Design an enzyme around this catalytic site. Structure first.
Site, PDB file in Angstrom:
ATOM      1  N   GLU A   1       4.045 -18.038  72.727  1.00 10.38           N
ATOM      2  CA  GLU A   1       5.052 -17.352  71.898  1.00 10.38           C
ATOM      3  C   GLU A   1       4.942 -17.900  70.480  1.00 10.38           C
ATOM      4  O   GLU A   1       4.892 -19.069  70.357  1.00 10.38           O
ATOM      5  CB  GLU A   1       6.484 -17.576  72.398  1.00 10.38           C
ATOM      6  CG  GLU A   1       7.484 -16.689  71.643  1.00 10.38           C
ATOM      7  CD  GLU A   1       8.928 -16.751  72.096  1.00 10.38           C
ATOM      8  OE1 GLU A   1       9.233 -17.517  73.027  1.00 10.38           O
ATOM      9  OE2 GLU A   1       9.762 -15.984  71.556  1.00 10.38           O
TER      10      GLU A   1
ATOM     11  N   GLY B   1      11.094 -26.841  71.225  1.00  7.37           N
ATOM     12  CA  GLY B   1      11.885 -27.539  72.227  1.00  7.37           C
ATOM     13  C   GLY B   1      11.372 -27.233  73.647  1.00  7.37           C
ATOM     14  O   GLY B   1      11.040 -28.135  74.392  1.00  7.37           O
ATOM     15  N   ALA B   2      11.348 -25.967  74.037  1.00 11.93           N
ATOM     16  CA  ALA B   2      10.902 -25.595  75.363  1.00 11.93           C
ATOM     17  C   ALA B   2      10.599 -24.101  75.440  1.00 11.93           C
ATOM     18  O   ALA B   2      11.046 -23.329  74.594  1.00 11.93           O
ATOM     19  CB  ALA B   2      11.931 -25.992  76.433  1.00 11.93           C
ATOM     20  N   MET B   3       9.882 -23.682  76.488  1.00 10.30           N
ATOM     21  CA  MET B   3       9.383 -22.321  76.586  1.00 10.30           C
ATOM     22  C   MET B   3       9.575 -21.683  77.985  1.00 10.30           C
ATOM     23  O   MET B   3       9.162 -22.262  78.989  1.00 10.30           O
ATOM     24  CB  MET B   3       7.907 -22.294  76.188  1.00 10.30           C
ATOM     25  CG  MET B   3       7.299 -20.901  76.240  1.00 10.30           C
ATOM     26  SD  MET B   3       8.077 -19.798  75.017  1.00 10.30           S
ATOM     27  CE  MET B   3       7.919 -18.260  75.906  1.00 10.30           C
ATOM     28  N   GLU B   4      10.132 -20.481  78.008  1.00 10.01           N
ATOM     29  CA  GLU B   4      10.570 -19.827  79.236  1.00 10.01           C
ATOM     30  C   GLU B   4       9.467 -19.051  80.002  1.00 10.01           C
ATOM     31  O   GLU B   4       9.750 -18.032  80.651  1.00 10.01           O
ATOM     32  CB  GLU B   4      11.745 -18.864  78.899  1.00 10.01           C
ATOM     33  CG  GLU B   4      11.331 -17.620  78.074  1.00 10.01           C
ATOM     34  CD  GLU B   4      11.432 -17.778  76.553  1.00 10.01           C
ATOM     35  OE1 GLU B   4      11.411 -18.921  76.089  1.00 10.01           O
ATOM     36  OE2 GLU B   4      11.497 -16.758  75.778  1.00 10.01           O
ATOM     37  N   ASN B   5       8.210 -19.512  79.949  1.00 12.54           N
ATOM     38  CA  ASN B   5       7.113 -18.768  80.599  1.00 12.54           C
ATOM     39  C   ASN B   5       7.500 -18.561  82.074  1.00 12.54           C
ATOM     40  O   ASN B   5       7.983 -19.465  82.744  1.00 12.54           O
ATOM     41  CB  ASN B   5       5.798 -19.503  80.530  1.00 12.54           C
ATOM     42  CG  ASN B   5       5.525 -20.127  79.212  1.00 12.54           C
ATOM     43  OD1 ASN B   5       5.251 -19.429  78.233  1.00 12.54           O
ATOM     44  ND2 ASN B   5       5.540 -21.468  79.177  1.00 12.54           N
TER      45      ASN B   5
ATOM     46  N   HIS C   1      19.047 -23.071  79.014  1.00 15.94           N
ATOM     47  CA  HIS C   1      18.528 -22.064  78.087  1.00 15.94           C
ATOM     48  C   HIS C   1      17.301 -21.402  78.620  1.00 15.94           C
ATOM     49  O   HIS C   1      17.256 -20.177  78.707  1.00 15.94           O
ATOM     50  CB  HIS C   1      18.210 -22.760  76.716  1.00 15.94           C
ATOM     51  CG  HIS C   1      17.791 -21.814  75.640  1.00 15.94           C
ATOM     52  ND1 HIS C   1      18.676 -21.249  74.754  1.00 15.94           N
ATOM     53  CD2 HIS C   1      16.589 -21.280  75.346  1.00 15.94           C
ATOM     54  CE1 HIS C   1      18.039 -20.409  73.960  1.00 15.94           C
ATOM     55  NE2 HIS C   1      16.773 -20.404  74.306  1.00 15.94           N
ATOM     56  N   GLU C   2      16.278 -22.180  78.921  1.00 14.79           N
ATOM     57  CA  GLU C   2      15.033 -21.595  79.386  1.00 14.79           C
ATOM     58  C   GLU C   2      15.203 -20.860  80.722  1.00 14.79           C
ATOM     59  O   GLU C   2      14.648 -19.762  80.923  1.00 14.79           O
ATOM     60  CB  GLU C   2      13.927 -22.591  79.446  1.00 14.79           C
ATOM     61  CG  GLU C   2      13.733 -23.438  78.191  1.00 14.79           C
ATOM     62  CD  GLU C   2      13.599 -22.674  76.876  1.00 14.79           C
ATOM     63  OE1 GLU C   2      13.232 -21.495  76.916  1.00 14.79           O
ATOM     64  OE2 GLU C   2      13.903 -23.289  75.799  1.00 14.79           O
TER      65      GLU C   2
ATOM     66  N   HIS D   1      16.742 -17.420  80.186  1.00 11.44           N
ATOM     67  CA  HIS D   1      15.801 -16.465  79.650  1.00 11.44           C
ATOM     68  C   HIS D   1      15.132 -15.686  80.795  1.00 11.44           C
ATOM     69  O   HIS D   1      14.559 -14.629  80.567  1.00 11.44           O
ATOM     70  CB  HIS D   1      14.661 -17.158  78.895  1.00 11.44           C
ATOM     71  CG  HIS D   1      14.864 -17.289  77.417  1.00 11.44           C
ATOM     72  ND1 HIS D   1      15.205 -16.224  76.601  1.00 11.44           N
ATOM     73  CD2 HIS D   1      14.725 -18.364  76.605  1.00 11.44           C
ATOM     74  CE1 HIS D   1      15.321 -16.658  75.357  1.00 11.44           C
ATOM     75  NE2 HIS D   1      14.978 -17.935  75.331  1.00 11.44           N
TER      76      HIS D   1
END
Ligand SMILES: CC(C)C[C@H](N)C(=O)O
Ligand code: NA
Ligand code: NA
Ligand code: NA
Ligand code: NA
Ligand code: NA
Ligand code: NA
Ligand code: NA
Ligand code: NA
Ligand code: NA
Ligand code: NA
Ligand code: NA
Ligand SMILES: [Zn+2]
Length: 866
Positions: free
Chosen positions: A117, A257-261, A293-294, A297
């Site tokens: 992303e 911070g972090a990623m919702e893959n 949060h992630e 998503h």
């Protein structure tokens, strides 16, 4: 580098329905084979235009025929003369070891991992790297078995094998079509924390948290928080997880911070790893927030995604709103709300007045990674919360349900979400939609009148938004304006008109209007913009006594805090002017008495007391002024702390001792007590020196948790106590091998008020625990200096600006996303005095002349110099 415009969106000429990837993984040279099933929707003569960056193209086939009708152009592979449906096969090579930007496939220590992303997948293979192209992925990974025993991608494992020469492979399949920004791959050697969650309807989900070998002792809180996120999403939103496995991987090198893959989230280890001796209460709560949060998503972002990147807030504003509601429901809603408001008024409002100002749904973008902003995220969430305020919880949830029912499995727009909310609730949001298209902070001016003859109270409310750098034309918004009227005893006066109750959320929709309330039996003290009901600046001529009365009587905790902020604001402004005149701090006795009352009120929630007793940051102070004097602000904050420490000394020490806790627990009541205690300690540190030194050093040495140790260490730094150097050296000697823990110490170095802080910060570029290769280290030293030590960054000699130029000259080539994050303090130059402005401009001019200036910096620099 050319801007892209939202109004230029057009449905794609081609779609991809299915993509099969094979990675022959190696850090020096990875070979990617991508087989895509494609369909032409546009005209028979339109070529397929695939995005690609830094790829070495090996071959192109179309239905197994080696293709001749193609060309490479800047950032693209353009393929002509295609059938209407076909199999595309691309083979290309990439180099993870050379990827210092951390976009695409890169190396994190000994692991390989991805960040796609917004537009990183094009650094992996040639593709329709845009989020309205959704496809079913299968991913085969082949690698050295000793270096990479775990090979992960989205979904479930469908095949596995062993090869000669010590290689093995694993293939994954994800049944949900996805845009490629949600693709992930991870390869490495990890410890794995394994657990399970059973959803409401009985689906058993395997939970797997991958961390570097030796870190499993720091993994359980993140796992616990994942399970809390899953349960809460079920209870509040009726949403369950939709796959069999949920994987999280903690990596040390990550720009954000972090990623919702989907099914394989990739997290900065800062938002995973915690133990009571390494992480503070605030870290624990951050981890909870970000894990949540992630997870959120998974629906707001993955099951419904974004049609184009200008719709980013559709997922981010909504998902931040969800993370805030999660945090608020599990913990202290008041404290959550207070701190989100601090961020809005203190950091977002500054962005909305800067050259980078944009609406939550942008209209023009050069580099999309520049728009992961306070505006898109935090103001986005305030816009969602406004919808919530206008609809009520039940109607809001009906809207959420209609949104998913219409758009599950597809890419949507901000406007689609607003429409669902409108159609499900029957609340008209036509005018409301202007919050998506207009930038800048509205100013809401309120005047009041009480008429004792008729017992009517009249509010005259006006609004305007000033022009911003991006938009010359502004119009009135639909502002939900919540109020509560208090009588002389502190009771709420019922709101009414002509014998009917009136909703306490006023619809402020015009440039000017009057609201008239009847049966107002006593002249009210109003609470205005309750719970910060819209993201606006409020102008109302409060008396000190109205504000102290609110601090004692208001029903919502938030309004008690907010009244205190308005009380202080007046005196912050007074004393900045005084500092510029060379005068001492002036503060009325009755203002100090108001804070004494909070310290001694045994009915007040300690969480609330603690926040009333935390002065506005230098960033929130800066929002009070048109032109910012960052030296005067820092000195005023220090002097106000010193004055209150002297005046309230005995009370502060008594509250400090009364809140002592021998057990450490990560539990909300305990956190609140500790936060009050350490707030008291902060004032005490600035009081009589000998007592301060003793209290602070003792807390540091006797602490059984990092919250208490760091609060003491931070006070020693801020008040420049005798014990400071020894405590700082102790922390270094104990924790230097632990980057996350050292980040705290780098922040304290970077934010030190000492006269030679810049010299010390420059020297720390050679510290054993520092590296320019790690975004977290960069941000904790350089970023904290520029962003959170504005007094030193803005030193009159311009030395702060020159240091940042030197760092950005490196980062522009190494990691432009981190560079762009770090340039922000310089692009605020129009808020400062002429002499600083000239120096900041000359710094920007120098950066503008860099060879190979990245698009990331170019966008911000050109806006700033306009
Ligand atoms: C650029 C991405 C790492 C941001 C991520 N989608 C988030 O909102 O958490
Ligand atoms: Na054709
Ligand atoms: Na598709
Ligand atoms: Na998403
Ligand atoms: Na709560
Ligand atoms: Na925040
Ligand atoms: Na928050
Ligand atoms: Na880029
Ligand atoms: Na409407
Ligand atoms: Na008045
Ligand atoms: Na500010
Ligand atoms: Na180093
Ligand atoms: Zn997000």
């Amino acid at each position: 580098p050319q801007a892209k415009y939202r109004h230029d969106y057009r449905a794609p000429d081609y779609q991809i329905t299915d993509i099969d990837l094979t990675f022959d993984l190696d850090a020096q040279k990875t070979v990617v084979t991508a087989v895509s099933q494609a369909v032409r929707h546009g005209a028979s003569d339109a070529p397929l235009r695939l995005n690609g960056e830094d790829l070495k193209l090996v071959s192109v086939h179309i239905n197994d025929e080696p293709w001749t009708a193609w060309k490479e152009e800047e950032g693209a592979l353009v393929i002509s003369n295609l059938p209407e449906r076909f199999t595309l096969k691309i083979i290309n090579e990439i180099s993870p070891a050379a990827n210092t930007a951390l976009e695409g496939l890169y190396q994190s220590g000994d692991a390989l991992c991805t960040q796609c992303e917004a537009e990183g997948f094009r650094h992996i293979t040639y593709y329709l790297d845009r989020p309205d192209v959704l496809a079913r992925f299968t991913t085969k990974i082949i690698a050295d078995k000793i270096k990479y025993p775990f090979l992960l991608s989205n979904g479930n494992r469908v095949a596995q094998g062993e090869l000669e020469n010590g290689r093995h492979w694993v293939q994954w399949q994800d049944p949900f079509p996805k845009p490629c920004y949600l693709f992930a791959l991870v390869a490495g050697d990890f410890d794995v924390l394994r657990d399970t969650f059973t959803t409401r309807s009985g689906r058993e989900v395997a939970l797997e948290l991958y961390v570097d070998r030796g870190n499993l002792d720091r993994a359980p809180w993140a796992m616990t928080s994942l399970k809390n996120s899953m349960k809460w999403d079920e209870e509040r939103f009726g949403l369950e997880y939709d796959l069999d496995i949920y994987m999280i991987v903690a990596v040390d090198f990550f720009n954000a911070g972090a990623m919702e893959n989907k099914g394989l989230n990739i997290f900065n280890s800062k938002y995973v790893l915690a133990r009571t001796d390494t992480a503070t209460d605030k870290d624990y709560l951050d981890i909870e927030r970000v894990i949540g949060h992630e997870y959120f998503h998974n629906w707001t972002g993955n099951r419904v995604t974004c049609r184009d990147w200008f719709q980013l807030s559709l997922k981010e504003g909504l998902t931040v709103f969800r993370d805030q509601e999660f945090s608020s429901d599990l913990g202290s809603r008041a404290v959550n709300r207070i701190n989100n408001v601090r961020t809005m008024r203190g950091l977002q409002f500054a962005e909305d007045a800067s050259p980078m100002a944009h609406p939550i749904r942008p209209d023009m973008v050069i580099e999309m990674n520049n728009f992961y902003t306070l505006t898109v995220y935090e103001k986005g969430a305030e816009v969602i919360r406004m919808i919530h305020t206008l609809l009520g919880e039940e109607n809001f949830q009906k809207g959420m349900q209609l949104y998913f029912e219409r758009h599950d499995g597809s890419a949507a727009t901000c406007d689609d979400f607003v429409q669902a909310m409108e159609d499900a609730s029957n609340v008209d949001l036509s005018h409301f939609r202007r919050w998506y298209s207009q930038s800048g902070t509205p100013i809401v001016t309120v005047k009041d009148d009480y008429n004792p003859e008729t017992e009517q109270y009249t509010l005259t409310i006006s609004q305007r938004t000033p022009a911003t750098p991006d938009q010359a034309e502004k119009q009135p918004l639909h502002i939900p304006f919540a109020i509560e009227l208090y009588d002389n005893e502190g009771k709420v006066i019922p709101l009414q008109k002509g014998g009917h109750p009136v909703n306490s959320v006023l619809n402020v929709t015009q440039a000017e209007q009057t609201f008239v309330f009847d049966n107002v039996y006593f002249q009210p003290v109003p609470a205005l913009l309750c719970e910060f009901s819209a993201p606006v600046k409020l102008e109302y001529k409060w008396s000190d006594q109205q504000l102290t009365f609110l601090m004692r009587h208001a029903r919502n905790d938030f309004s008690r805090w907010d009244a205190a902020q308005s009380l202080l604001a007046t005196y912050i402004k007074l004393n900045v002017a005084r500092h510029q005149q060379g005068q001492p701090l002036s503060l009325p006795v009755h203002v100090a008495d108001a804070f004494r009352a909070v310290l001694l009120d045994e009915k007040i929630d300690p969480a609330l007391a603690a926040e009333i007793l935390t002065l506005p940051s230098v960033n929130e102070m800066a929002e009070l002024f048109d032109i910012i004097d960052p030296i005067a602000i820092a000195e005023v904050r220090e002097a106000l702390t010193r004055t209150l420490a002297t005046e309230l000394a005995d009370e502060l020490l008594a509250i400090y001792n009364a809140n002592y806790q021998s057990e450490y627990r990560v539990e909300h009541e305990d956190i609140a007590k500790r936060t009050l205690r350490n707030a008291c300690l902060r004032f005490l540190a600035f009081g009589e020196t000998h007592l301060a030194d003793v209290l602070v050093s003792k807390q540091f040495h006797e602490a059984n948790n990092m919250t208490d140790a760091l609060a003491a260490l931070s006070a020693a730094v801020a008040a420049q106590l005798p014990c400071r150097d020894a405590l700082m050296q102790e922390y270094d000697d104990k924790w230097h091998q632990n980057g996350l823990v050292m980040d705290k110490w780098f922040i304290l170095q970077a934010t030190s008020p000492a006269a030679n802080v810049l010299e010390t910060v420059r020297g720390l570029l050679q510290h054993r625990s520092f590296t320019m290769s790690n975004p977290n280290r960069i941000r904790s030293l350089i970023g904290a200096f520029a962003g959170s030590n504005p007094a030193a960054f803005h030193a009159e000699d311009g030395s702060g600006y020159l240091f940042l130029v030197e760092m950005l000259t490196d980062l522009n080539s190494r990691n432009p996303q981190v560079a762009s994050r770090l340039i922000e303090p310089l692009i605020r130059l129009k808020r400062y005095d002429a002499k600083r402005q000239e120096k900041m401009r000359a710094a920007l001019e120098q950066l503008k002349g860099l060879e190979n200036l990245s698009g990331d910096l170019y966008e911000k620099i050109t806006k700033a110099l306009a």
